[PDB]
Amino acid sequence: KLVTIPFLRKYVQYAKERVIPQLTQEAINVIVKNYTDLRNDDNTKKSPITARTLETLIRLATAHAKVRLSKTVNKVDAKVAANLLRFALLGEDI
Amino acid sequence: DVKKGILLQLFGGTNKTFTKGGRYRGDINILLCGDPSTSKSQILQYVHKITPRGVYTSGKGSSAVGLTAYITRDVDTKQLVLESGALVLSDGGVCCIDEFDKMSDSTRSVLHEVMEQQTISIAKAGIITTLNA
Amino acid sequence: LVRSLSPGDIVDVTGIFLPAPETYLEAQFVKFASFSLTSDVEERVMELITSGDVYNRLAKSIAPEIYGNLDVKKALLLLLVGGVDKRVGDGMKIRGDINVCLMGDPGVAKSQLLKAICKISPRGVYTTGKGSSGVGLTAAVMKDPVTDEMILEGGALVLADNGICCIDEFDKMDESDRTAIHEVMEQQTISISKAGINTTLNARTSILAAANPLYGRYNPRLSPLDNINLPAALLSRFDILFLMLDIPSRDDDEKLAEHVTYVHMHNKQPDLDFTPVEPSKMREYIAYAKTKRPVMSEAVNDYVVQAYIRLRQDSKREMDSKFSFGQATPRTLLGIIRLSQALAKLRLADMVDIDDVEEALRLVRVSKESLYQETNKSKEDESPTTKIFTIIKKMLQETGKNTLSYENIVKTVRLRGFTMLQLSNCIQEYSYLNV
């Protein structure tokens, strides 16, 4: 069941003006643990992991919670942002 | 030993003009060398304030056109005029040039005639004139 | 009132709006020195002095979204104030500005540090390297569409007079863009000779560049001069040359990740041990300290000369090593004077003490020790026999005999504080090996 074109545009404006996600204590420990493991891996030398990767994981976790209209970031929203960043930095489907 | 040479550059020898002979350049061309940050740029800023017609230019900031005579135009008559450069406006003083080693190849060839006959011969756009410097 | 409006001033022109059958304004009445000494502003300055520890409070209040780099933020505080402009009566104008350059791998938030000092300074202009060529950096000679006169439009080094010039990507700049930079860091002037306009404009700005390595990351196997595409002439004019290396560490990455998540959650800084200073009150403390001109003391002049000898001797012995830095140029000696004079302005003192000289010399040693590791070992607490051997070397220096009858060395040990029983055991030990 695919959503129509005009119905997809209304979901973006309504979620970006009424739902404000917040970082919980459970989602912080997942991002911190995933950020330290990426900088310590020897296979991540193809792309320089700087301070932008720490802010990119928080922006992707907050944008994922806006789709489900949730005001809190759980552990499910942190696993999607971690898998999306590993595919763009390493290039392999883990 | 460095200040004793610059003092003689401000005075300089006389100009024994000849009628049937060539013109001899009586100026003193001094060139400073060595490691930088040794009060080299401060000397060029002090001679300019003493000489009434001294100028201060850089190496890459002035090519072979800014030192000679750039063909400018008047903003009143809209005609092709000839404006003097850094080497022509200093008729009687000391010219201070910074970063002499950072000059282009087209600019170093023009100074060969200024340090010998003290004349700048420009032949561009059908205008072959000799400027005295 | 004619012949009184200078190009580049911010005044309040009062007049009448009369049309012309075009609309003109008939003139009727017409920086850091324009702020008056208001009683309400002076009360806010004294509130920060009585609180105690003003040097460390303003050093941590800048850039609340950047964790770490305590020594890097300390040099940015003195850049807003600066030294004194001692004008010699002979005709020499000593430059009082500080030239600080930030280096390292592009990941220590270099773009955030350049924009933080631009919003704080009232006359700061931020620019890049490739986006601003030689025309946008110096001055553009455009044509007037009315009077048809060749004017001089101010660029980045002209509009930011008496302020801080923020330049991004100093390594990706062209060769024609470093011409005016060499003149500002030496004479604070811009030599323009285009379109028949041979005028010189003053540029008393604070250049704060940010270089980047050519190979992206830093290479410890290569020399520091070859890793950065910058000549040695530009490094001699810069006073402080930092090098923030991105060293992977589990302790530094854990504290940095927690500070980032706290900013993107509460839109504020984490609670520390002091209240953050608002940028509206920080400008009042910097402008008030610029009016005070501290004078160098006579007792502190001997410590500056002795520090320059030890600094020049260490750089000469490291010329053939792997960490071969720049030569001990005389420009580096004047940088310590400008840093020590700027530290006295924050303490509201007209005389430079010994603490200001040691604090200024510490910032230079930190930027130079960024290449070495944090492994320092020192041990000097062995048996007291070595201290007694130093007394025997004094007798051999004046004479040089290894006789057994020693009647003058015993009189020197008693004046020190050692006992006579332990002295007999040290002489017999050295006499066995014939020393």
mmCIF file of C-alpha atoms in Angstrom, chain C residues 88-412:
data_model
loop_
_atom_site.group_PDB
_atom_site.id
_atom_site.type_symbol
_atom_site.label_atom_id
_atom_site.label_comp_id
_atom_site.label_asym_id
_atom_site.label_seq_id
_atom_site.Cartn_x
_atom_site.Cartn_y
_atom_site.Cartn_z
ATOM 1 C CA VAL C 88 57.930 56.403 18.804
ATOM 2 C CA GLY C 89 58.600 60.123 18.465
ATOM 3 C CA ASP C 90 61.189 59.463 15.758
ATOM 4 C CA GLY C 91 58.574 58.096 13.353
ATOM 5 C CA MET C 92 58.266 54.398 14.193
ATOM 6 C CA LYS C 93 54.814 52.917 14.851
ATOM 7 C CA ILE C 94 55.154 49.651 16.773
ATOM 8 C CA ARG C 95 52.367 47.243 15.838
ATOM 9 C CA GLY C 96 50.376 46.212 18.905
ATOM 10 C CA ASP C 97 48.189 43.566 17.267
ATOM 11 C CA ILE C 98 48.685 39.838 17.856
ATOM 12 C CA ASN C 99 49.018 37.402 14.941
ATOM 13 C CA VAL C 100 47.567 34.001 15.882
ATOM 14 C CA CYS C 101 47.252 31.121 13.409
ATOM 15 C CA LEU C 102 45.342 27.893 14.048
ATOM 16 C CA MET C 103 46.480 24.628 12.454
ATOM 17 C CA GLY C 104 45.779 20.907 12.690
ATOM 18 C CA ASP C 105 43.451 18.393 11.114
ATOM 19 C CA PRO C 106 40.098 19.788 9.896
ATOM 20 C CA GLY C 107 38.033 18.359 12.741
ATOM 21 C CA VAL C 108 38.706 20.482 15.823
ATOM 22 C CA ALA C 109 35.838 22.834 14.878
ATOM 23 C CA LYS C 110 37.920 25.376 12.990
ATOM 24 C CA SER C 111 34.938 27.030 11.286
ATOM 25 C CA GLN C 112 33.118 27.484 14.606
ATOM 26 C CA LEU C 113 36.070 29.219 16.283
ATOM 27 C CA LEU C 114 36.392 31.745 13.447
ATOM 28 C CA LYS C 115 32.691 32.666 13.535
ATOM 29 C CA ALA C 116 32.591 32.909 17.340
ATOM 30 C CA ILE C 117 35.224 35.672 17.455
ATOM 31 C CA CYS C 118 33.517 37.542 14.601
ATOM 32 C CA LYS C 119 30.168 38.042 16.350
ATOM 33 C CA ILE C 120 31.862 39.152 19.582
ATOM 34 C CA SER C 121 34.071 41.762 17.930
ATOM 35 C CA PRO C 122 32.084 44.819 16.771
ATOM 36 C CA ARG C 123 34.281 45.291 13.686
ATOM 37 C CA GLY C 124 34.942 41.722 12.526
ATOM 38 C CA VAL C 125 34.581 40.474 8.952
ATOM 39 C CA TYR C 126 34.607 36.741 8.208
ATOM 40 C CA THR C 127 35.833 35.507 4.829
ATOM 41 C CA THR C 128 37.298 32.436 3.142
ATOM 42 C CA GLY C 129 40.286 31.918 0.848
ATOM 43 C CA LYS C 130 39.124 30.818 -2.595
ATOM 44 C CA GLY C 131 35.896 32.828 -2.465
ATOM 45 C CA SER C 132 37.752 36.111 -1.866
ATOM 46 C CA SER C 133 40.564 36.750 -4.349
ATOM 47 C CA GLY C 134 42.945 39.707 -4.534
ATOM 48 C CA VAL C 135 40.176 42.127 -5.505
ATOM 49 C CA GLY C 136 37.745 41.283 -2.704
ATOM 50 C CA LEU C 137 40.435 41.132 -0.021
ATOM 51 C CA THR C 138 42.195 44.417 -0.835
ATOM 52 C CA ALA C 139 40.016 47.039 -2.534
ATOM 53 C CA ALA C 140 37.886 47.052 -5.685
ATOM 54 C CA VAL C 141 38.406 50.038 -8.003
ATOM 55 C CA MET C 142 34.896 50.421 -9.408
ATOM 56 C CA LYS C 143 33.356 53.236 -11.463
ATOM 57 C CA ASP C 144 30.729 55.623 -10.125
ATOM 58 C CA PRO C 145 27.477 55.562 -12.151
ATOM 59 C CA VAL C 146 26.790 59.246 -11.374
ATOM 60 C CA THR C 147 29.925 61.379 -11.026
ATOM 61 C CA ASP C 148 31.966 58.915 -13.151
ATOM 62 C CA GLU C 149 34.824 58.917 -10.627
ATOM 63 C CA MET C 150 37.042 55.954 -9.761
ATOM 64 C CA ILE C 151 36.379 55.329 -6.060
ATOM 65 C CA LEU C 152 37.940 52.767 -3.698
ATOM 66 C CA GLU C 153 35.436 50.231 -2.371
ATOM 67 C CA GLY C 154 36.485 48.668 0.923
ATOM 68 C CA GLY C 155 36.884 44.906 0.967
ATOM 69 C CA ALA C 156 37.715 42.594 3.867
ATOM 70 C CA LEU C 157 40.945 44.201 5.116
ATOM 71 C CA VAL C 158 39.519 47.741 4.855
ATOM 72 C CA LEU C 159 36.051 47.504 6.421
ATOM 73 C CA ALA C 160 37.422 45.493 9.380
ATOM 74 C CA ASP C 161 39.741 48.259 10.595
ATOM 75 C CA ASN C 162 40.658 48.216 14.301
ATOM 76 C CA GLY C 163 39.140 44.752 14.632
ATOM 77 C CA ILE C 164 39.710 41.051 13.935
ATOM 78 C CA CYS C 165 39.956 39.703 10.382
ATOM 79 C CA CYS C 166 38.694 36.116 10.104
ATOM 80 C CA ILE C 167 40.240 34.234 7.169
ATOM 81 C CA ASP C 168 39.241 30.637 6.426
ATOM 82 C CA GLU C 169 41.317 28.109 4.458
ATOM 83 C CA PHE C 170 44.695 29.826 4.484
ATOM 84 C CA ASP C 171 46.405 26.939 2.664
ATOM 85 C CA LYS C 172 44.045 26.954 -0.349
ATOM 86 C CA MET C 173 44.806 30.605 -1.163
ATOM 87 C CA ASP C 174 46.488 31.794 -4.347
ATOM 88 C CA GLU C 175 49.880 33.478 -4.660
ATOM 89 C CA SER C 176 48.376 36.882 -5.519
ATOM 90 C CA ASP C 177 46.311 36.926 -2.302
ATOM 91 C CA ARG C 178 49.311 36.905 0.072
ATOM 92 C CA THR C 179 50.629 40.269 -1.165
ATOM 93 C CA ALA C 180 48.544 42.521 1.095
ATOM 94 C CA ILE C 181 48.885 40.100 4.025
ATOM 95 C CA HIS C 182 52.661 40.596 4.179
ATOM 96 C CA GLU C 183 52.158 44.376 4.425
ATOM 97 C CA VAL C 184 49.456 44.355 7.118
ATOM 98 C CA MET C 185 51.479 42.109 9.447
ATOM 99 C CA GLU C 186 54.476 44.470 9.088
ATOM 100 C CA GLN C 187 53.299 48.045 8.432
ATOM 101 C CA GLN C 188 49.485 47.720 8.765
ATOM 102 C CA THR C 189 49.049 49.344 5.345
ATOM 103 C CA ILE C 190 47.739 48.352 1.914
ATOM 104 C CA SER C 191 49.666 49.539 -1.154
ATOM 105 C CA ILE C 192 47.231 50.064 -4.045
ATOM 106 C CA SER C 193 48.453 51.093 -7.500
ATOM 107 C CA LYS C 194 45.583 50.400 -9.911
ATOM 108 C CA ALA C 195 43.662 52.663 -12.303
ATOM 109 C CA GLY C 196 46.144 55.461 -11.660
ATOM 110 C CA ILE C 197 45.369 55.526 -7.924
ATOM 111 C CA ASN C 198 48.607 55.305 -5.924
ATOM 112 C CA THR C 199 47.242 55.651 -2.400
ATOM 113 C CA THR C 200 47.933 53.734 0.812
ATOM 114 C CA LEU C 201 45.094 52.686 3.125
ATOM 115 C CA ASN C 202 45.630 51.797 6.773
ATOM 116 C CA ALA C 203 44.716 48.248 7.844
ATOM 117 C CA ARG C 204 45.125 47.711 11.597
ATOM 118 C CA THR C 205 43.301 44.380 11.658
ATOM 119 C CA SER C 206 43.955 41.156 13.575
ATOM 120 C CA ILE C 207 44.540 38.362 11.057
ATOM 121 C CA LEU C 208 43.227 35.034 12.403
ATOM 122 C CA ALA C 209 43.853 32.437 9.696
ATOM 123 C CA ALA C 210 43.214 28.687 9.786
ATOM 124 C CA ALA C 211 45.587 26.512 7.757
ATOM 125 C CA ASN C 212 44.950 22.905 6.750
ATOM 126 C CA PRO C 213 47.340 20.102 5.762
ATOM 127 C CA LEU C 214 47.786 19.224 2.109
ATOM 128 C CA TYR C 215 47.255 15.474 2.638
ATOM 129 C CA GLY C 216 44.156 15.975 4.797
ATOM 130 C CA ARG C 217 45.519 14.396 7.967
ATOM 131 C CA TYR C 218 48.817 15.277 9.612
ATOM 132 C CA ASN C 219 51.863 13.103 8.940
ATOM 133 C CA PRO C 220 54.268 12.735 11.901
ATOM 134 C CA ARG C 221 56.919 11.154 9.655
ATOM 135 C CA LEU C 222 57.267 14.365 7.612
ATOM 136 C CA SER C 223 58.623 17.738 8.677
ATOM 137 C CA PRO C 224 56.166 20.376 9.954
ATOM 138 C CA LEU C 225 57.298 22.783 7.221
ATOM 139 C CA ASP C 226 56.659 20.279 4.406
ATOM 140 C CA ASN C 227 53.264 19.101 5.683
ATOM 141 C CA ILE C 228 51.783 22.621 5.482
ATOM 142 C CA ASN C 229 51.951 24.434 2.129
ATOM 143 C CA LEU C 230 53.146 27.679 3.708
ATOM 144 C CA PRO C 231 56.598 29.307 3.469
ATOM 145 C CA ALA C 232 58.791 30.028 6.471
ATOM 146 C CA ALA C 233 58.447 33.796 5.962
ATOM 147 C CA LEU C 234 54.762 33.783 6.939
ATOM 148 C CA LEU C 235 55.353 31.694 10.073
ATOM 149 C CA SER C 236 57.869 34.241 11.376
ATOM 150 C CA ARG C 237 55.279 37.039 11.409
ATOM 151 C CA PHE C 238 52.729 34.954 13.333
ATOM 152 C CA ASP C 239 53.119 35.179 17.106
ATOM 153 C CA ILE C 240 51.278 31.992 18.148
ATOM 154 C CA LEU C 241 51.158 28.924 15.875
ATOM 155 C CA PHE C 242 48.790 26.355 17.367
ATOM 156 C CA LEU C 243 48.478 22.761 16.141
ATOM 157 C CA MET C 244 45.309 20.991 17.304
ATOM 158 C CA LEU C 245 46.018 17.381 16.326
ATOM 159 C CA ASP C 246 43.038 15.005 16.281
ATOM 160 C CA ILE C 247 44.494 12.233 18.443
ATOM 161 C CA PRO C 248 42.049 9.310 18.916
ATOM 162 C CA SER C 249 41.433 8.748 22.627
ATOM 163 C CA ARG C 250 38.681 6.929 24.505
ATOM 164 C CA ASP C 251 38.670 9.490 27.335
ATOM 165 C CA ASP C 252 38.463 12.575 25.106
ATOM 166 C CA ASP C 253 35.816 11.119 22.779
ATOM 167 C CA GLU C 254 33.550 10.137 25.684
ATOM 168 C CA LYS C 255 33.510 13.629 27.206
ATOM 169 C CA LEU C 256 33.071 15.261 23.787
ATOM 170 C CA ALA C 257 30.080 13.111 22.801
ATOM 171 C CA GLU C 258 28.252 13.956 26.037
ATOM 172 C CA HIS C 259 28.770 17.695 25.510
ATOM 173 C CA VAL C 260 27.374 17.549 21.965
ATOM 174 C CA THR C 261 24.227 15.652 22.972
ATOM 175 C CA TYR C 262 23.559 18.144 25.777
ATOM 176 C CA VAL C 263 23.672 21.095 23.368
ATOM 177 C CA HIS C 264 21.306 19.534 20.806
ATOM 178 C CA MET C 265 18.800 18.738 23.594
ATOM 179 C CA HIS C 266 18.426 21.778 25.878
ATOM 180 C CA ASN C 267 19.828 24.376 23.420
ATOM 181 C CA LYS C 268 22.229 25.536 26.146
ATOM 182 C CA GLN C 269 25.591 24.728 27.717
ATOM 183 C CA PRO C 270 26.094 22.167 30.504
ATOM 184 C CA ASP C 271 26.110 23.485 34.058
ATOM 185 C CA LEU C 272 29.695 24.027 35.214
ATOM 186 C CA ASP C 273 31.108 25.984 38.170
ATOM 187 C CA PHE C 274 30.350 29.510 36.913
ATOM 188 C CA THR C 275 27.662 31.446 35.073
ATOM 189 C CA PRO C 276 28.186 32.088 31.344
ATOM 190 C CA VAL C 277 28.943 35.675 30.358
ATOM 191 C CA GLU C 278 26.581 37.144 27.781
ATOM 192 C CA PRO C 279 28.149 38.684 24.648
ATOM 193 C CA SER C 280 26.471 42.023 25.417
ATOM 194 C CA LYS C 281 28.524 42.429 28.610
ATOM 195 C CA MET C 282 31.772 41.012 27.198
ATOM 196 C CA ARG C 283 32.097 43.899 24.730
ATOM 197 C CA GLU C 284 31.978 46.412 27.593
ATOM 198 C CA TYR C 285 34.916 44.777 29.391
ATOM 199 C CA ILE C 286 37.129 44.631 26.289
ATOM 200 C CA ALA C 287 36.509 48.250 25.277
ATOM 201 C CA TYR C 288 37.189 49.423 28.839
ATOM 202 C CA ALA C 289 40.540 47.603 28.976
ATOM 203 C CA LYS C 290 41.687 49.095 25.659
ATOM 204 C CA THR C 291 41.865 52.581 27.190
ATOM 205 C CA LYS C 292 44.335 51.415 29.855
ATOM 206 C CA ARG C 293 47.918 51.366 28.551
ATOM 207 C CA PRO C 294 50.184 49.241 30.783
ATOM 208 C CA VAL C 295 53.877 50.084 31.068
ATOM 209 C CA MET C 296 56.609 47.454 31.162
ATOM 210 C CA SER C 297 58.440 47.137 34.470
ATOM 211 C CA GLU C 298 62.202 47.361 34.894
ATOM 212 C CA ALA C 299 62.599 44.234 37.039
ATOM 213 C CA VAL C 300 60.780 42.093 34.445
ATOM 214 C CA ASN C 301 63.100 43.166 31.615
ATOM 215 C CA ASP C 302 65.826 40.764 32.765
ATOM 216 C CA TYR C 303 63.458 37.781 32.596
ATOM 217 C CA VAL C 304 62.481 38.503 28.982
ATOM 218 C CA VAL C 305 66.099 38.613 27.792
ATOM 219 C CA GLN C 306 66.968 35.408 29.661
ATOM 220 C CA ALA C 307 63.915 33.669 28.185
ATOM 221 C CA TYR C 308 64.925 34.595 24.628
ATOM 222 C CA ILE C 309 68.377 33.041 25.083
ATOM 223 C CA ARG C 310 66.986 29.707 26.292
ATOM 224 C CA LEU C 311 64.400 29.693 23.492
ATOM 225 C CA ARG C 312 67.007 30.387 20.796
ATOM 226 C CA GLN C 313 69.363 27.697 22.117
ATOM 227 C CA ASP C 314 66.689 24.982 22.026
ATOM 228 C CA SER C 315 65.690 25.857 18.452
ATOM 229 C CA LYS C 316 69.300 25.771 17.227
ATOM 230 C CA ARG C 317 69.918 22.258 18.569
ATOM 231 C CA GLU C 318 66.697 20.973 16.944
ATOM 232 C CA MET C 319 67.660 22.093 13.429
ATOM 233 C CA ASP C 320 68.742 18.607 12.295
ATOM 234 C CA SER C 321 65.988 16.715 14.146
ATOM 235 C CA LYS C 322 62.629 15.560 12.792
ATOM 236 C CA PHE C 323 60.646 18.320 14.552
ATOM 237 C CA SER C 324 62.595 21.141 12.912
ATOM 238 C CA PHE C 325 60.523 24.279 13.501
ATOM 239 C CA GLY C 326 61.340 27.856 12.500
ATOM 240 C CA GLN C 327 64.433 29.839 13.379
ATOM 241 C CA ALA C 328 64.564 32.101 16.442
ATOM 242 C CA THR C 329 63.584 35.228 14.537
ATOM 243 C CA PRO C 330 63.506 38.611 16.321
ATOM 244 C CA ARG C 331 59.786 38.855 15.502
ATOM 245 C CA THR C 332 59.083 36.082 18.021
ATOM 246 C CA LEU C 333 60.684 38.170 20.779
ATOM 247 C CA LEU C 334 58.255 41.044 20.183
ATOM 248 C CA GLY C 335 55.334 38.605 20.287
ATOM 249 C CA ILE C 336 55.976 37.794 23.944
ATOM 250 C CA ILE C 337 55.971 41.517 24.762
ATOM 251 C CA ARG C 338 52.614 42.027 23.036
ATOM 252 C CA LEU C 339 51.141 38.996 24.818
ATOM 253 C CA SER C 340 52.414 40.154 28.215
ATOM 254 C CA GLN C 341 51.074 43.685 27.708
ATOM 255 C CA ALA C 342 47.646 42.340 26.729
ATOM 256 C CA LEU C 343 47.472 40.219 29.890
ATOM 257 C CA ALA C 344 47.929 43.288 32.106
ATOM 258 C CA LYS C 345 44.897 44.972 30.519
ATOM 259 C CA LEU C 346 42.580 42.199 31.729
ATOM 260 C CA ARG C 347 43.798 42.615 35.326
ATOM 261 C CA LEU C 348 43.402 46.432 35.202
ATOM 262 C CA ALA C 349 47.072 47.025 36.032
ATOM 263 C CA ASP C 350 49.336 49.721 34.593
ATOM 264 C CA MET C 351 52.502 47.687 35.290
ATOM 265 C CA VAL C 352 53.511 44.272 33.952
ATOM 266 C CA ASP C 353 54.399 41.893 36.782
ATOM 267 C CA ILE C 354 56.346 38.625 36.651
ATOM 268 C CA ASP C 355 53.146 36.557 36.447
ATOM 269 C CA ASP C 356 52.228 38.153 33.109
ATOM 270 C CA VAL C 357 55.564 37.155 31.556
ATOM 271 C CA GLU C 358 55.283 33.531 32.694
ATOM 272 C CA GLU C 359 51.694 33.294 31.436
ATOM 273 C CA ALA C 360 52.630 34.683 28.015
ATOM 274 C CA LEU C 361 55.579 32.286 27.707
ATOM 275 C CA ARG C 362 53.366 29.317 28.619
ATOM 276 C CA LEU C 363 51.097 29.815 25.598
ATOM 277 C CA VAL C 364 54.110 29.703 23.265
ATOM 278 C CA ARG C 365 55.476 26.498 24.805
ATOM 279 C CA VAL C 366 52.073 24.797 24.545
ATOM 280 C CA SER C 367 51.738 25.475 20.811
ATOM 281 C CA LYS C 368 55.296 24.192 20.288
ATOM 282 C CA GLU C 369 54.842 21.035 22.399
ATOM 283 C CA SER C 370 51.746 19.889 20.481
ATOM 284 C CA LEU C 371 53.856 17.488 18.395
ATOM 285 C CA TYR C 372 55.438 15.674 21.350
ATOM 286 C CA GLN C 373 53.538 13.049 23.317
ATOM 287 C CA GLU C 374 52.346 13.330 26.925
ATOM 288 C CA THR C 375 55.094 11.036 28.285
ATOM 289 C CA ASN C 376 57.372 12.965 30.658
ATOM 290 C CA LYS C 377 59.589 11.211 33.210
ATOM 291 C CA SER C 378 61.875 12.828 35.779
ATOM 292 C CA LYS C 379 63.710 11.362 38.772
ATOM 293 C CA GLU C 380 66.444 12.971 40.895
ATOM 294 C CA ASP C 381 66.378 11.602 44.461
ATOM 295 C CA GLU C 382 69.137 9.004 44.826
ATOM 296 C CA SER C 383 71.684 8.514 47.608
ATOM 297 C CA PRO C 384 73.280 11.644 49.133
ATOM 298 C CA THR C 385 76.707 10.448 47.938
ATOM 299 C CA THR C 386 76.260 12.354 44.666
ATOM 300 C CA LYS C 387 75.860 15.653 46.534
ATOM 301 C CA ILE C 388 79.138 15.074 48.391
ATOM 302 C CA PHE C 389 80.897 14.255 45.108
ATOM 303 C CA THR C 390 80.056 17.752 43.843
ATOM 304 C CA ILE C 391 82.155 19.232 46.659
ATOM 305 C CA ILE C 392 85.160 17.133 45.612
ATOM 306 C CA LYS C 393 84.830 18.459 42.054
ATOM 307 C CA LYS C 394 85.239 22.016 43.365
ATOM 308 C CA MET C 395 88.625 21.181 44.896
ATOM 309 C CA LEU C 396 89.831 19.486 41.704
ATOM 310 C CA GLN C 397 88.763 22.527 39.671
ATOM 311 C CA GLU C 398 90.974 24.890 41.683
ATOM 312 C CA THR C 399 93.864 22.429 42.104
ATOM 313 C CA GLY C 400 93.507 18.944 40.635
ATOM 314 C CA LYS C 401 95.273 16.546 43.004
ATOM 315 C CA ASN C 402 94.069 13.129 44.153
ATOM 316 C CA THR C 403 95.885 13.046 47.492
ATOM 317 C CA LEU C 404 94.669 11.134 50.534
ATOM 318 C CA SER C 405 95.067 14.003 53.027
ATOM 319 C CA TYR C 406 91.849 16.036 52.706
ATOM 320 C CA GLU C 407 91.563 18.720 55.395
ATOM 321 C CA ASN C 408 89.678 21.407 53.438
ATOM 322 C CA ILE C 409 86.821 19.254 52.114
ATOM 323 C CA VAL C 410 85.729 18.341 55.651
ATOM 324 C CA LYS C 411 85.167 22.019 56.477
ATOM 325 C CA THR C 412 82.815 22.381 53.497
#
